Amino acid sequence: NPDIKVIKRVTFDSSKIYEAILKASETITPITPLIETKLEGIANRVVAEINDRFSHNIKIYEIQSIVEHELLEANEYAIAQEYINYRTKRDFERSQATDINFTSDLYNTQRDLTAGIVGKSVGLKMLPPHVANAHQKGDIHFHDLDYSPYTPMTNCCLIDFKGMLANGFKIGNAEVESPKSIQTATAQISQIIANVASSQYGGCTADRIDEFLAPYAELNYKKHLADAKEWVTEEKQEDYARAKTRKDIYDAMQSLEYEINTLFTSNGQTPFTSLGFGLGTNWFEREIQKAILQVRILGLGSEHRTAIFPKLIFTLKRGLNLEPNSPNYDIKQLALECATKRMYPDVLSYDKIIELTGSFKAPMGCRSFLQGWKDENGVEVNSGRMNLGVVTLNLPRIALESKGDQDKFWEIFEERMGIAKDALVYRVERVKEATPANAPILYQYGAFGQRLRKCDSVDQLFKHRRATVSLGYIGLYEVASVFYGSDWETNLEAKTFTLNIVKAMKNACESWSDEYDYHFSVYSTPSESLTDRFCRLDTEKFGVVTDITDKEYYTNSFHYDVRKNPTPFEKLEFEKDYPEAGATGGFIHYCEYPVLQQNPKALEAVWDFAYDRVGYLGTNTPIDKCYKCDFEGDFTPTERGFMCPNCGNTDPKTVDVVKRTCGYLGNPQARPMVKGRHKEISARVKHMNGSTIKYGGK
Amino acid sequence: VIKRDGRMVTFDSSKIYEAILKASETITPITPLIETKLEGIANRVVAEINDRFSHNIKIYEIQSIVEHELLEANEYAIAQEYINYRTKRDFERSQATDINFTKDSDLYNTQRDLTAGIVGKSVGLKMLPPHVANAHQKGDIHFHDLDYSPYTPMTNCCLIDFKGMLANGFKIGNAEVESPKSIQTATAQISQIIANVASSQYGGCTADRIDEFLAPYAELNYKKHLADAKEWVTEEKQEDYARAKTRKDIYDAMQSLEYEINTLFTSNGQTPFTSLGFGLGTNWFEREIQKAILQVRILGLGSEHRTAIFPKLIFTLKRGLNLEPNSPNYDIKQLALECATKRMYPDVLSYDKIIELTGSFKAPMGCRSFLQGWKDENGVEVNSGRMNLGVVTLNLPRIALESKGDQDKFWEIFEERMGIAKDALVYRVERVKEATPANAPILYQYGAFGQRLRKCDSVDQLFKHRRATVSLGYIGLYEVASVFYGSDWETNLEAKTFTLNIVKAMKNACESWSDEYDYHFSVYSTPSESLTDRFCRLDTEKFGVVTDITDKEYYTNSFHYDVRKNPTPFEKLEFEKDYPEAGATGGFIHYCEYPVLQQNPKALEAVWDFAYDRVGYLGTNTPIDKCYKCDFEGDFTPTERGFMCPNCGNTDPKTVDVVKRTCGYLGNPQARPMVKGRHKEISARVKHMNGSTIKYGGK
Ligand SMILES: Nc1ncnc2c1ncn2[C@H]1C[C@H](O)[C@@H](COP(=O)(O)OP(=O)(O)OP(=O)(O)O)O1
Ligand SMILES: Nc1ncnc2c1ncn2[C@H]1C[C@H](O)[C@@H](COP(=O)(O)OP(=O)(O)OP(=O)(O)O)O1
Ligand SMILES: Nc1ncnc2c1ncn2[C@H]1C[C@H](O)[C@@H](COP(=O)(O)OP(=O)(O)OP(=O)(O)O)O1
Ligand SMILES: Nc1ncnc2c1ncn2[C@H]1C[C@H](O)[C@@H](COP(=O)(O)OP(=O)(O)OP(=O)(O)O)O1
Ligand SMILES: Cc1cn([C@H]2C[C@H](O)[C@@H](COP(=O)(O)OP(=O)(O)OP(=O)(O)O)O2)c(=O)[nH]c1=O
Ligand SMILES: Cc1cn([C@H]2C[C@H](O)[C@@H](COP(=O)(O)OP(=O)(O)OP(=O)(O)O)O2)c(=O)[nH]c1=O
Ligand SMILES: [Mg+2]
Numbered sequence A: 001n002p003d004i005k006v007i008k009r010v011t012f013d014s015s016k017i018y019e020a021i022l023k024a025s026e027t028i029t030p031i032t033p034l035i036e037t038k039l040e041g042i043a044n045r046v047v048a049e050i051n052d053r054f055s056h057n058i059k060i061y062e063i064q065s066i067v068e069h070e071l072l073e074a075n076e077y078a079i080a081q082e083y084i085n086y087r088t089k090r091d092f093e094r095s096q097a098t099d100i101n102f103t104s105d106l107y108n109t110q111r112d113l114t115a116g117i118v119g120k121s122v123g124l125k126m127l128p129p130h131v132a133n134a135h136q137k138g139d140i141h142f143h144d145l146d147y148s149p150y151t152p153m154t155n156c157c158l159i160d161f162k163g164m165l166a167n168g169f170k171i172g173n174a175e176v177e178s179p180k181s182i183q184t185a186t187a188q189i190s191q192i193i194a195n196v197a198s199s200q201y202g203g204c205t206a207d208r209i210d211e212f213l214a215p216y217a218e219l220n221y222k223k224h225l226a227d228a229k230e231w232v233t234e235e236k237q238e239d240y241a242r243a244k245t246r247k248d249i250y251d252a253m254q255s256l257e258y259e260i261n262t263l264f265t266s267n268g269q270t271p272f273t274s275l276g277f278g279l280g281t282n283w284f285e286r287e288i289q290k291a292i293l294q295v296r297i298l299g300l301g302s303e304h305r306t307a308i309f310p311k312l313i314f315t316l317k318r319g320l321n322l323e324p325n326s327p328n329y330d331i332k333q334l335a336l337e338c339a340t341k342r343m344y345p346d347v348l349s350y351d352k353i354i355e356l357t358g359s360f361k362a363p364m365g366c367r368s369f370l371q372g373w374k375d376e377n378g379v380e381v382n383s384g385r386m387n388l389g390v391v392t393l394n395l396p397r398i399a400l401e402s403k404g405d406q407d408k409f410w411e412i413f414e415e416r417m418g419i420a421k422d423a424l425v426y427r428v429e430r431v432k433e434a435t436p437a438n439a440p441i442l443y444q445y446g447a448f449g450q451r452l453r454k455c456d457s458v459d460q461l462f463k464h465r466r467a468t469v470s471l472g473y474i475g476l477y478e479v480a481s482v483f484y485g486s487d488w489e490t491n492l493e494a495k496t497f498t499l500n501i502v503k504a505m506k507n508a509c510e511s512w513s514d515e516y517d518y519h520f521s522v523y524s525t526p527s528e529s530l531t532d533r534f535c536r537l538d539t540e541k542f543g544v545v546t547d548i549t550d551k552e553y554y555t556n557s558f559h560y561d562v563r564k565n566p567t568p569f570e571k572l573e574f575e576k577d578y579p580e581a582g583a584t585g586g587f588i589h590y591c592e593y594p595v596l597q598q599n600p601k602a603l604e605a606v607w608d609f610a611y612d613r614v615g616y617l618g619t620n621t622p623i624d625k626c627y628k629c630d631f632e633g634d635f636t637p638t639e640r641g642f643m644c645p646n647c648g649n650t651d652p653k654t655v656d657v658v659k660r661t662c663g664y665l666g667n668p669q670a671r672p673m674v675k676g677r678h679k680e681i682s683a684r685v686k687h688m689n690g691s692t693i694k695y696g697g698k
Numbered sequence B: 001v002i003k004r005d006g007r008m009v010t011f012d013s014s015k016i017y018e019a020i021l022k023a024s025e026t027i028t029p030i031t032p033l034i035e036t037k038l039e040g041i042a043n044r045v046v047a048e049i050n051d052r053f054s055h056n057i058k059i060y061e062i063q064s065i066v067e068h069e070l071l072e073a074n075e076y077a078i079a080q081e082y083i084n085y086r087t088k089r090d091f092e093r094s095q096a097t098d099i100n101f102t103k104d105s106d107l108y109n110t111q112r113d114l115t116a117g118i119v120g121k122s123v124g125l126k127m128l129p130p131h132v133a134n135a136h137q138k139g140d141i142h143f144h145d146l147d148y149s150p151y152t153p154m155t156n157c158c159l160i161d162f163k164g165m166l167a168n169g170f171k172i173g174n175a176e177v178e179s180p181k182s183i184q185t186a187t188a189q190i191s192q193i194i195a196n197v198a199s200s201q202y203g204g205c206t207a208d209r210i211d212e213f214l215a216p217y218a219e220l221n222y223k224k225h226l227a228d229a230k231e232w233v234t235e236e237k238q239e240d241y242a243r244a245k246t247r248k249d250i251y252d253a254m255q256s257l258e259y260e261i262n263t264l265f266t267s268n269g270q271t272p273f274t275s276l277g278f279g280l281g282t283n284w285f286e287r288e289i290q291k292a293i294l295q296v297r298i299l300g301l302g303s304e305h306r307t308a309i310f311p312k313l314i315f316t317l318k319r320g321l322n323l324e325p326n327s328p329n330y331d332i333k334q335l336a337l338e339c340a341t342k343r344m345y346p347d348v349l350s351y352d353k354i355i356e357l358t359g360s361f362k363a364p365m366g367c368r369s370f371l372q373g374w375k376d377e378n379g380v381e382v383n384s385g386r387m388n389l390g391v392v393t394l395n396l397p398r399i400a401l402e403s404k405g406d407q408d409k410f411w412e413i414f415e416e417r418m419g420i421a422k423d424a425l426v427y428r429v430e431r432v433k434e435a436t437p438a439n440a441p442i443l444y445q446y447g448a449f450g451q452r453l454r455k456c457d458s459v460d461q462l463f464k465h466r467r468a469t470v471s472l473g474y475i476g477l478y479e480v481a482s483v484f485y486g487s488d489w490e491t492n493l494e495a496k497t498f499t500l501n502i503v504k505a506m507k508n509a510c511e512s513w514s515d516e517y518d519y520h521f522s523v524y525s526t527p528s529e530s531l532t533d534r535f536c537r538l539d540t541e542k543f544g545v546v547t548d549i550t551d552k553e554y555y556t557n558s559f560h561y562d563v564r565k566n567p568t569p570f571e572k573l574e575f576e577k578d579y580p581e582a583g584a585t586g587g588f589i590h591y592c593e594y595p596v597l598q599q600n601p602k603a604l605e606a607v608w609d610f611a612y613d614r615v616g617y618l619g620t621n622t623p624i625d626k627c628y629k630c631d632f633e634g635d636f637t638p639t640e641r642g643f644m645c646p647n648c649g650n651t652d653p654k655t656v657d658v659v660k661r662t663c664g665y666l667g668n669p670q671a672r673p674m675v676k677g678r679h680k681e682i683s684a685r686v687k688h689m690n691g692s693t694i695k696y697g698g699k
């Protein structure tokens, strides 16, 4: 009956079931119409029984079982005996194939490297065949094979810290109740982040940190007020309590900030965590925001090194803090100084984001985002969601192999979108194989909003479009340049073509989301591990191509060509169209600047201009420092990294260089990057005219 | 639920699990490890059955899920024995009208670490020299922790020089931090240092004299609070205020240390093995630090007041300081008495006994290891900053069995095995020497080993001149004595002399090796963390069941008195005091079993006072298990599949709370159950004092 579908490892096919009975039977006896009048009744019975019970969907293993009982029911044993011995023998064949026992760096990093090599080796065989071939050939790119599909792994998530900190939780070998202070709250925040980072292969974010940290500031205030009433005179109670509470808040901030920058995971790297704030109204939230900004401004240790993680993310709201008469303008000035001195934080626009996605929430992960979602109770919830997995297309390759023909380009585009849909469905189904006991921090103690049991299934946290899945892309500029040359931003035809590409991607994602009941959204791939393999594996097959492959990298998604130097206003006006057109699952814009430490007004003007147009902005200032000769400014890039342009100094021990790589920053000296990423960073040019040097040097 | 015939029955999760019990039954009798694994598979099927169906469920599709679930969980052996048994019954169940016929419950990082360890072990087994590798595989000796070494030039233990490297500052992760200006910051830095160090090694770690180097930071907090009081509070109360707040802050500085250490884990996926020592403080700050540590351990962990497992607090007893009732620190000793009675921790050390046994006084190293008196070139004696290097274990019962009652043949094989072990130890030290300071900047580059070295330098500077201790393991003195003189040799002077001669020969061989190779070689009573789970099983295959050698399915741990016998602790300690004096000074610990004495610490105080002069390291075990379903605390009956409450029969770890001392570090059964070999050791333990083993029954 049409009312029932079928789920593969597609519509129900009585012929497909009828073929299974026949092909097994022919192992021992020839086909003869003397017994086929019975086998047809056998296949009809197994169809009429499936229809009577299951109405939504059926797995393949249940199709096999529902036949085996029916074969035994109709007094048949000759072929059923042969039926089982092949189905079982094949079942261990696929499991034994995907078996581990099928045989100047930190020690944990080496052990994780070997484990990841083994995991990639088993997962490549675990993957379905055609998607594996596409990934190997380079048509598409699976993401982070070193952990999936070998183990059920979620890409990145928005940790619900409010839920845990409300009613306590359990971590490690201990279980704890709700914190009764602010320093305790920050310590638990850091410990929880560290524990979560080892149970997933991506970043994490703490949205509205001040909003859910305010009650513990109130608790500290009450404790200090009681202590003052006991000890100090009845005239200076309020002043002493407020001063002690402020000092405790700032101290807790320092602790957390430093705790994140120290703890690592099995990978041996600092977790890719980030924080967001800016919606505070009362006094405690304002003090918390001031403490965060000040502790980021101060530095990292005795040398006042630039902090890399967590990635702070500000929030600009009209009426809250946008204009000089706004009640939180001082916080905005502090954030401006922090941005011009430490390249952080990134500013978010309340109205633009709430219009684009559906509800304001901090970008969880590197640059990912979530649409507005409500549960059965009608209350909107943002913290507690997650992204299962990501794969990325190869738009420049499709553009290049099209030989300048648009219709053929669209045909191969549809083919690749189908391949990517199959990959995404497999990734979702593999993730759905997780169990709460696999990670009690995530699925058992409120990391996802709900607290299930080992008796329950994890799919309750993913269905009804609660959990998003991102399909990535890269190199829209190269795609347009294939057909319209290097300079096409002044042409409406190429811009319309790119917008149509994004719109087709969005429409396919919407159709898939409606079909599979998971929010399939497009995604701006951050080129974390994409261009390094993509450029070389495409230049091996297509050769050197002018302005498309000779750069030795791929332009990230839809941003303006980094080789060009337009004014930031022009760049933002050009770029505002893509997120509006459907590129809403993840996006971030960049703006280069000279040293603006003595002139932060330009950044304020840019933020005010970008508030209405874009919903996400990032600054790129030359804040590199060389302690040997007290140099401050930019660094000249070479194939061996960077060096100070006064002494040739290059060792990471006495130099400080950070550059924005993929949403996050990174220090290339302490961790060298791939050559493609290095070429991409070097090719970057400044946007507004100014001297990129603060202190000349000794 | 729809039965095969029909009708309606309730869905019981026990019926699903009981079948899987018979599944693995045909292949292997129920074991504690397989108990959780079997119920791990039983947890997936119960989750899936209710997911697919809503109103009715019959049997011939649940049998499909469990058939599928076993395959999906890599357990083919149970599945291979399931399907054939499953398929057999339905065929016979069929009846014609006339004539018929004629793995998934572990953490992600845990699984990844398991895979990495398997790869490392496979590489290391071929990295070894031939004869030592063959001896290890044959069960002749044990090369400890092949998972991490010699694949990586690891290190066994490390006495983190917390004082100096905290005072001078250090760089961890991506952040360089200076000296702390508060005790809370100091304890946070200590916790992160411990976590990083444990991540950079395959063994335990400890912090000795924590109060001694934590006093200055408490003084700094006191000074800051005094400065604040001089500006806020009135005059006559000022100093008093500066006390109270400080007394609170120190408490917090310990409270975090109780949780952070418990929470943070290494790449292995388990809490790092770590311990703390104290007791030598004299001034007010050190006294308050010790009181805070004891109080936070007493209070418990979390809302359920669960017993803490780590770190292992280790008290220190000194005559004229904290021993006699007239001593200035007798209240601290009484608090330690209560805490040890109610929490199995801390253990004790004798200042004079230890300082005369191992040259100087130092906290025991990691699990049970020890160091020896040592002075650097400048002549200043240094204790913290040294490190152990590696451990291998001898199979004494194998030598005893191959002797067949001939002492001279026993000595011949003993010398042969000593030569093999010396070759193994030299190879392990040489492999470790191949490390580079950049391999772990926390250890070799930032003061965690004492000296600080640059990248372009060799690690041998931190190991040579007998600085780094290197230890050789042994186990089963009671078994080798009973092979010759019967299982009741405790009253025979000749057998005791024979065992002491064995220990003396080992000590002399270690001394000669240390003289030759310029590394301190010391015999070390290895803890049976997994040795008896492997040594005994491999021995019982080659030699069969022997009379009170292998029938017990375990090996007696080093020189300890026979576990089956129950002598009063005074005679037990009198008997056991001779072995460490004979030369077994590299590592040891003396256990002591008591009934529930919560309202009677006087017996424990008397035992400690008696053992201060004779024994240098004592650990008391008292049943402190407690379950919350029926609210009973006391002892537990060691059933085959772990443990259960004697009253309500509860087993679930989410409600029960049982702690047992498993070779130095008290473990957590029902959390990570141990091998069946060790479970027999715990079950066979007795109580060395007459008294009730229960405290308060259930409801
Ligand atoms: N579209 C379908 N409708 C109903 N049953 C199906 C359908 N496809 C497969 N089945 C059932 C019939 C058999 O009992 C069982 C195996 O059929 P099969 O086509 O081999 O699936 P499959 O996923 O293994 O494809 P293949 O074997 O080519 O990899 O699955
Ligand atoms: N040799 C055989 N003897 C009896 N029945 C068989 C035999 N081969 C196949 N069948 C039946 C049972 C199988 O479920 C069905 C489909 O065949 P087949 O695709 O080869 O196995 P499978 O569907 O379980 O996995 P896969 O197709 O991917 O190998 O036809
Ligand atoms: N009433 C039930 N509730 C839940 N599961 C059941 C129930 N009855 C049987 N099962 C499941 C548990 C096992 O996975 C599988 C086989 O168990 P089994 O005890 O042999 O069933 P059964 O019907 O044969 O009982 P019996 O042999 O006493 O009649 O069926
Ligand atoms: N000896 C065994 N070895 C391995 N698995 C077994 C063994 N005995 C039983 N099992 C498994 C498979 C059985 O389906 C299940 C329940 O046992 P059993 O009751 O004997 O068969 P059954 O319940 O499926 O049919 P029935 O109720 O008619 O006996 O447990
Ligand atoms: C990681 C961590 C957890 N916790 C847990 C332990 C407790 O279960 C929970 C309660 O935190 P607290 O607020 O410290 O509870 P308290 O009873 O000690 O109150 P006060 O400090 O004012 O005397 O927080 C800490 O206290 N400190 C830490 O560093
Ligand atoms: C991980 C961690 C580091 N640190 C670092 C920060 C400093 O570099 C060093 C000294 O500790 P601090 O006492 O914080 O130094 P300070 O200059 O901020 O003085 P105060 O807090 O009294 O105002 O320890 C912490 O303070 N807390 C932490 O949790
Ligand atoms: Mg098939």
Ligand SMILES: [Mg+2]
Pocket: none
């Ligand atoms: Mg039965």
Ligand SMILES: [Mg+2]
Pocket: B252, B255
């Ligand atoms: Mg507290």
Ligand SMILES: [Zn+2]
Pocket: A626, A627, A628, A629, A630, A631, A644, A645, A646, A647, A648, A649, A697
């Ligand atoms: Zn310079």
Ligand SMILES: [Zn+2]
Pocket: B627, B628, B629, B630, B631, B632, B645, B646, B647, B648, B649, B650, B698
């Ligand atoms: Zn009970």
